């Protein structure tokens, strides 16, 4: 099967150029005219078409993005890249690479990569545990999770036990804090029986700051003194 993965920096400073490269695996960039193209989407807004390049190297660009857009092909690496210069805050969006092929258009898209346009520097996240306890259970099941706080820019990805855990997982959309940075929470519902015996580790990854952090989540250990049995 043909897949499209995208890459490049997810933070550019204003009035600078954007570098993005989409790599085609499981197929060739040489099939007469496929119309490899780029489409961006501002957060909470709709889709906007940027432009395309095909086998010959001819290019059509969206008018508003003309003179700022340049797309090219590397057939020996099976790649096509996009360059957008003099970038403003209104260019912060998720960028998708897609191929417009044969009937209609856009049969295959990429994973999408977000580009935040900021003068600010990249800040990695702080991962705090949301430990399950008596007040964190309501009936047969109990809740636990991970708080990923004070990071920039988007996105982060959270996985529990290297993907082994999926049923009952809820990762919330990030929010702008009152002071600049992003923050989200990932939680998971579990039966209250599996508290003392099963291990829960959230795996947070922040590619912009190249930061990976695993954090074991254990039941709350209250230390306003109790009595302990040996």
């Amino acid at each position: 099967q043909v897949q499209l993965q995208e890459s490049g920096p997810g933070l550019v400073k204003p009035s600078e150029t954007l570098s993005l490269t989409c790599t085609v695996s499981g197929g060739s960039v040489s099939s007469g005219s496929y119309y490899w193209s780029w489409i961006r989407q501002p957060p909470g807004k709709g889709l906007e078409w940027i432009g395309y390049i095909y086998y010959s190297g001819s290019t059509n660009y969206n008018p508003s993005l003309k003179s700022r857009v340049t797309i090219s092909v590397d057939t020996s690496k099976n790649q096509f890249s996009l360059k957008l210069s003099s970038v403003t805050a209104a260019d912060t969006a998720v960028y998708y690479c897609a191929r417009e092929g044969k009937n209609g258009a856009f049969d295959i898209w990429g994973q999408g990569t977000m580009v935040t346009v900021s003068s600010a520097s990249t800040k990695g996240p702080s991962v705090f545990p949301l430990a399950p306890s008596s007040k964190s259970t309501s009936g047969g099941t109990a809740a636990l999770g991970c708080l990923v706080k004070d990071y920039f820019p988007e996105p982060v990805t959270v996985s529990w036990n290297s993907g082994a855990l999926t049923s009952g997982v809820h990762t919330f959309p990030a929010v702008l804090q009152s002071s600049g940075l992003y923050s989200l929470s990932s939680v998971v519902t579990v039966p209250s029986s599996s508290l003392g015996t099963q291990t829960y580790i959230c795996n947070v990854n922040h590619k912009p700051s190249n930061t990976k952090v695993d954090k074991k989540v254990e039941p709350k250990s209250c230390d306003k003194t109790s009595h302990h049995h040996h």
């Binding site: 709709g46 998708y96 009937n103 209609g104 430990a131 309501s138 708080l147 929010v175 923050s183 929470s185």
Partner: protein, 212 residues
């Protein structure tokens, strides 16, 4: 530039209902108009090419009609996994343009939320910050009211919340409300309450803790 108008912007429908979306173009584009399904956090997915042809892998419950300027996308019997936002795109002449988008939400019976509260972690307290998280799991509708109370004092303006999207299976929502204070303010108070008001609740539900 070819302008694409989509109507309606938002609609709620039940499982098995017949859904009808309208996309209108400024000029005739014959049968060059594609339909895409974009779920939140995912890339768009091609549903219909030409104007009525079903892309391979797309269920038969999707169908599109239209030719020239006025087009229609129709789902015969809405499934819980059909919750997404649908865009129409003309494929006639450059520049390629997309529609305004139509958010399709799922209607279901009332579901009450189960409320969980999390005190700030010890690791976060060493950093000088304290965040109290209140969690509402698997409920409907999306409309909910979260009110914090610190020592029975009604808090305001220092909390944020985010909602998940509809569960692909049971069509419920989940909501987390995060109250963040300085470690100084957290140490200077005892009681911390989370008051939840919802249609699924006969009376407001409050989860609270007090060692802080």
């Amino acid at each position: 530039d070819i302008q694409m108008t989509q109507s309606p912007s938002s609609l709620s429908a039940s499982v098995g209902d017949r859904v009808t979306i309208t996309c209108r173009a400024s000029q005739s584009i014959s049968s060059y108009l594609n339909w895409y399904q974009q779920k939140p956090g995912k890339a768009p997915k091609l549903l219909i090419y030409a104007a009525s042809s079903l892309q391979s892998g797309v269920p038969s419950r999707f169908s599109g009609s239209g030719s020239g300027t006025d087009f229609t996308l129709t789902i015969s019997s809405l499934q819980p996994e059909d919750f997404a936002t649908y865009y129409c795109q003309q494929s006639y002449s450059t520049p390629l343009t997309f529609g305004g988008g139509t958010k399709v939400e799922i209607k279901r019976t009332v579901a009450a939320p189960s409320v969980f509260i999390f005190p700030p972690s010890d690791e976060q307290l060493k950093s000088g910050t304290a965040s109290v998280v209140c969690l509402l799991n698997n409920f409907y509708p999306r409309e909910a009211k979260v009110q914090w109370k610190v020592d029975n004092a009604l808090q305001s303006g220092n909390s944020q919340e985010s909602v998940t999207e509809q569960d692909s299976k049971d069509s419920t929502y989940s909501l987390s409300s995060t109250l963040t204070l300085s470690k100084a303010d957290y140490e200077k108070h005892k009681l911390y309450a989370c008051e939840v008001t919802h249609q699924g609740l006969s009376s407001p539900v409050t989860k609270s803790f007090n060692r802080g």
